[PDB]
Symmetry: D2
Subunit: 403 residues, 4 copies
């Protein structure tokens, strides 16, 4: 009833839009008995009601952009007063056009029983972002950086992104400190890249892997001098953000030491199978599946929550920044985070003119309680796409890259 365990463990903006859309739906749309005559009329009016609302939100976003532009780098944006937990909008969003296009496909205005869904709005928001970047191309601030979530139909589109002179970064929560591992699982991307004759080697090496959220950076290399292809680790000094440089190594190791100890305690208390392994690396410590032998989500969630709470009461850990991740059957504790990794890549690709958030798009699937490495953090560093299927990713990439 009243959950006493509620605070021990949703996108408000989207639910907000859903509420605004539901009011005309229940009043005008819910007119089920109707196809005898007035359902063209009902659909038409309902479509207009929805379109108007999205157009109103368009202006609210643009007002927020302007307010945030001048007053940031204490007032509040209108939209921020309406939606307190809303994230920054680095780009304009043609919501009305996006809706009308999606309504063409899925006939949302033509429904009388099923209100505009969370997925409906999510698709509109994603379509709007893509539409924005395509608009700049036929003029603006075009898309310079696309990032993906590591922790196949997508592989070709990655290659063409690179050919179109767009930097591609793969952000993973994996704490592996050796290139070799990433070469072993990103095999297909590496060899298909390598084996492709079209791409100049310059564009070929614009592919990067930001491991440990923002702990390790690897870049693609092609040395057919040796016919050696794969990923080369980049020295910290080139890609490390200034604030991260200030972190003491002692606090880093102390943080990782305390984390690894906490993991082992959790292991014993939870009496986890011995096939479950705790892996410690240079900038990361994590727990991994075994043999077949996996971990329950409650166990994964217990681990992340325990790690976050303990470390947040650990002084070395607060003098730095850390992230936790429990997406798959693995829980990773890494130094840094999603936002830091994306912004590091922005500076890395062009130090003289760092890639702006307005020119950055993070196609991510970790908009969930996957930990502090959630893709909501990525909204701090740039524009994002919210994908729920690999096909969704391909669809979005296809329309983006369509001439």
């Amino acid at each position: 009833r009243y959950r006493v365990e509620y605070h021990l463990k949703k996108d408000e903006f989207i639910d907000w839009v859903k509420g605004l859309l539901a009011s005309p739906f229940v009043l005008h749309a819910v007119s089920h008995e109707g196809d005898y005559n007035d359902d063209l009329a009902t659909t038409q009016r309902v479509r207009s009601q929805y379109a108007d609302i999205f157009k109103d939100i368009e202006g609210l976003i643009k007002d927020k952009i302007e307010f945030d532009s001048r007053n940031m780098s204490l007032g509040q944006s209108r939209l921020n007063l309406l939606v307190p937990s809303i994230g920054t909008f680095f780009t304009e969003l043609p919501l009305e056009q996006a809706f009308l296009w999606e309504d063409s496909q899925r006939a949302i205005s033509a429904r009388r029983m099923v209100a505009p869904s969370f997925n409906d709005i999510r698709h509109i928001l994603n379509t709007a972002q893509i539409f924005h970047f395509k608009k700049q191309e036929n003029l603006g601030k075009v898309l310079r950086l696309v990032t993906f979530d590591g922790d196949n139909p997508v592989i070709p589109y990655i290659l063409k992104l690179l050919r179109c002179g767009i930097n591609v970064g793969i952000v993973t929560a994996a704490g592996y400190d050796e290139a070799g591992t990433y070469e072993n699982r990103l095999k297909g991307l590496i060899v298909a890249l390598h084996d492709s004759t079209d791409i100049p080697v310059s564009q070929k090496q614009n592919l990067t892997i930001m491991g440990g959220e923002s702990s390790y950076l690897f870049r693609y290399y092609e040395d057919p001098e040796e016919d050696n292809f794969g990923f080369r680790q980049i020295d910290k000094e080139e890609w490390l953000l200034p604030r991260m440089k200030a972190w003491s190594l002692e606090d880093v190791e102390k943080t990782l030491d305390f984390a690894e100890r906490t993991l082992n305690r959790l292991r014993k208390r939870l009496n986890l199978p011995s096939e479950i392994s705790i892996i410690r690396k240079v900038r990361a410590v994590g727990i991994v599946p075994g043999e077949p032998v996996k971990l329950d989500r409650e166990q994964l969630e217990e681990i992340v929550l325990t790690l976050q709470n303990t470390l947040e009461s650990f002084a070395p850990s607060r003098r730095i920044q850390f992230s936790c991740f429990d997406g798959g059957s693995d829980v990773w504790c890494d130094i840094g985070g999603k936002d830091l990794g994306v912004r590091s890549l922005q500076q890395f690709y062009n130090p003289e003119s760092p890639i702006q958030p307005s020119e950055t798009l993070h196609v991510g699937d970790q908009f969930a309680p996957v930990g502090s490495a959630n893709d909501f953090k990525a909204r701090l560093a740039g524009c994002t796409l919210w994908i729920a299927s690999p096909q969704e990713t391909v669809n979005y990439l296809h329309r983006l890259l369509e001439t």
Copy 2:
């Protein structure tokens, strides 16, 4: 936000389990979370917490049994029915504490200090308890052993256990919302099962032939067959008179077809209004009508829900359709409107296998993945006909059947 559209859709969620979750949360926050951070004696805390959880489950056991006795009456209500008003009938005693202690070993529930006992935890405990019961009745003098196991249709590690079930002398039926009126389709769909059963040496033919397919929810019945003169196997259609329940035989054909005709017209209206692509096609059969994806192609989720909600509401205002029970299903990316229901299908099978001594609900177990808003063909209706297992993964089915059939 006050969702003004809430009541337009089905938002059924197992109140009994949520009720159990709420009870377990009180010892959790006062004993588990109150000793979060305690580096020393974790074992003591886990033991006290587990004991508190176990006591609660044993209390619920008692409530369940009392209800079973108070439902043997037939208007008062069981004490449990007062606590949880939407509770279903318990055809069988549930060893909940034993099931909790077993799952607590696997899932380590009592050891957690941050994450409370979950819905899935209770679901696992409830399912394990249902299995544990039937395993107890096997050796028992006057125990009611499991006679019928039912599955949901609409290579595969379930097939061996289905074969093992049949060999163990247990009747197995598959209830599919598909409305196809030919045995050929189900032979094509379930070719993996029929081939393995055909190739199974350890199972006598009488036990093999104890495999049935309930086409529609209760519209068509098919039985496995193995010709003794020729190497021909597959599925045979059974005449209506042998398996059709009395009330179903009382149903008028004209109302049946009026319903299906109305449903078919309603489907094409929806097709136009939602401007669905031309390959989405609408298929009409003898006792069922449905809309299926085509190729060049598929239907959105919300569109599928729009269809079943439309069909259900419209037909529930159709007089011939109230004289004759019907069902809708949008689980896959198809929507099928079938005459009858899942409840009817299970009890039809209960009668068919042994007409003279019909299989009781206490001897029936439906393994279902459709305990969801999948229309009126949901597995909550199967709780009317007998005991159920709530499965969320195919691996759960395998594990559940493994525990049951383990010697």
Copy 3:
């Protein structure tokens, strides 16, 4: 749907409130500091609100038409009561908006009471429009509540009677004698007696229904004795056909079990001895002693226990029954509030019973006060949700004005 009170267990108003929340956030809160746009902001907000109410009017009309023969509104709001009359929602909003300045608010959304006020104003508006036409269904019966075991409403009751409108007071007290209600309503009968401007014939159209629908009394003025007061109308005249088939033994068995149940509750709750149990012909109840009163938790415990207990008692379900814990009293009565209103509708004109569309129940018991709540009165006719005596007076003034 639990029968036991764990937390604070009208959906239509909350549904409307949710609707009104959309223009509030998108068009009002967005303009909190736009102090020169106050004219345009308020105008747009007022139109947005008014458009919603106009839309709900249509859905209500659809519900009425459908119920004349679920409705969309029933699908949207499953706990919605029947609308016996159409309501002018848009105008009611605009009128109340002038007084309350709802559209000018940027920090506070349209409230529950805002809508309740608008709904009440709409109901009164409807009758007034019907009135001037006279052609339409005019208000013939107004019912009030005095259910519990200084008043400016009295002159308006008198004005209602002089306007040829029948006035009934429905009460859950369940006392079986006229003298008690004469004393409780002394101010009303004195004022009515002292009124020279009202014909005795019209004075006689004042009735009181005790025990929800168990006892009926009428106002009388006889020249011979030269007094006045209340005379109990015989059962044959006002009893509904459903109630006539009710067996006396079931009635007695119901009350006897209820009285027994009350006595154990006294024991177990260790209630003070000053607390007494009163038994009447068609009612049994627990009343506060002497100040010695009962906690609301205790009163709720009593009503919930009785309802659950009696609804599992075969004689009681061959019967209808009601419980009421409004004040610091709990009464178990044979009748029901809907039955009382329906009985009065027949009593005044047996040939052509007063239609629900010509009936208005001004009630203050739209609360968890047991099965005797005023939501039951919505079954028998139109209603008015009042929170203050001033509200009643205000609503009655608008109703009876030129």
Copy 4:
């Protein structure tokens, strides 16, 4: 933030805890009129143990709360985040057992332990604590009792007993009136009773104080022996003002009040308020008051919310502290707060040894959405009692003062 819809999380948290034994051991046993004593006894035992557990949690929080006080958090703060500060130990079980005897909470089978049940228990426990310290050797006994004075009798005797018992009594109001006359005219009878009461020394008589504008004006009862002059006398600010308040800029104070006065004048035109409603401006406060004419609770809350959020975006107001009150028909904007008001009185009575929060009990009837001057703010300065009825105040004071 804006308000769409309409308590105390700690009480709700305890209610949810007590609800679990209720459903299983009480609701289940309805219809069982035999065995009811046994059922009641067990149910009582279950409830009591929960309270004893919560007692322990409080003692732990208090000791953790010795770490800082004007990282991490108490386990109670994790479970209930919006929980206030407990300056004293609370005998919850003893209080429950007493309240269960009076209210028969454990005997109920259909009605769970209510919000009011717990509230009474918490209030009783607070009283119980101070009574034991009166017993104990040199225990931190009650030294300051504060009351609310509202804005534009059985309680009077108990105040006198408090004063005669050597307990300092203060009355805090949101009224912005800066003249002693208004309060001699508002607190008549009490002054007369104190003047007429021969059984009280005038030294103890003077321990009665009035805090106006929450913490803006201080008036102390005076009684000249030879000239028959009695009433309230304003105390000079340097004597009772807290240091932080002394450092406040008069300009910022004035600028804040002037902004509020214009905001108030804006609101009355916007809301088209009647001309009978008058706006009152004082030295340390500005307010809106009813006419000869009254204001809706929506209008009252609109004004408070508007004023509150507006001034929070006003820099001079940020550099000061302000409070708002809409309990009565009036809406007052006063410089300071109830918290600052109580604490100022704590130093005023005895500057060499300021009265501690553990020695201060605030009996208040404003634990509601009354604005920033609510009694929840008083929990920052000391112990409190939640009052819903005037008779509750009388009964509570009686039990506190009984011997």
